[PDB]
Amino acid sequence: GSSGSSGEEDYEQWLEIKVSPPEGAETRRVIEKLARFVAEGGPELEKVAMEDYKDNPAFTFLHDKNSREFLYYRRKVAEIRKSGPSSG
């Protein structure tokens, strides 16, 4: 088996290192939305999101896979990930 996962709370240890510039906080309100919508449901969302904002000059990060936005979205996902839904 070539798969090992050590740590958990570390998920927040990432939030410590945000993406640059720090202006992303402006979109954070929107980013967190995605994550909260992704980490919440899963990849299915990340797939739908690409459609929801198919034509969005704001969510231009979605498609792209090398945008600070796409990074911050993941840095937060780890946050919501830990604690997202409330049932299981």
> What does the block give as tokens for 6?
């050590």
Tell me how many helices (H) and strands (E) the chain has: 5, 0
Q: Fill in the amino acid letter for 27.
A: T
Question: What technique was this entry resolved by?
Answer: NMR
Q: Fill in the amino acid letter for 48.
A: V
The whole-angstrom separation of Cα 5 and Cα 73 is: 21
Q: Fill in the amino acid letter for 68.
A: R
The whole-angstrom separation of Cα 71 and Cα 64 is: 11
Q: What CATH number was assigned to the domain covering residues 1-88?
A: 1.10.10.790
> What does the block give as tokens for 9?
């709370």
The whole-angstrom separation of Cα 20 and Cα 37 is: 23
Q: Which helix (H) or strand (E) is 29 found in, with range?
A: helix 25-41
Q: Are 84 and 37 in contact (CB under 8 A)?
A: no
Residue 21: asked if its preceding bond is cis (omega within 30°), the reply is: yes
> What does the block give as tokens for 49?
């999101």
Q: Are 11 and 78 in contact (CB under 8 A)?
A: yes
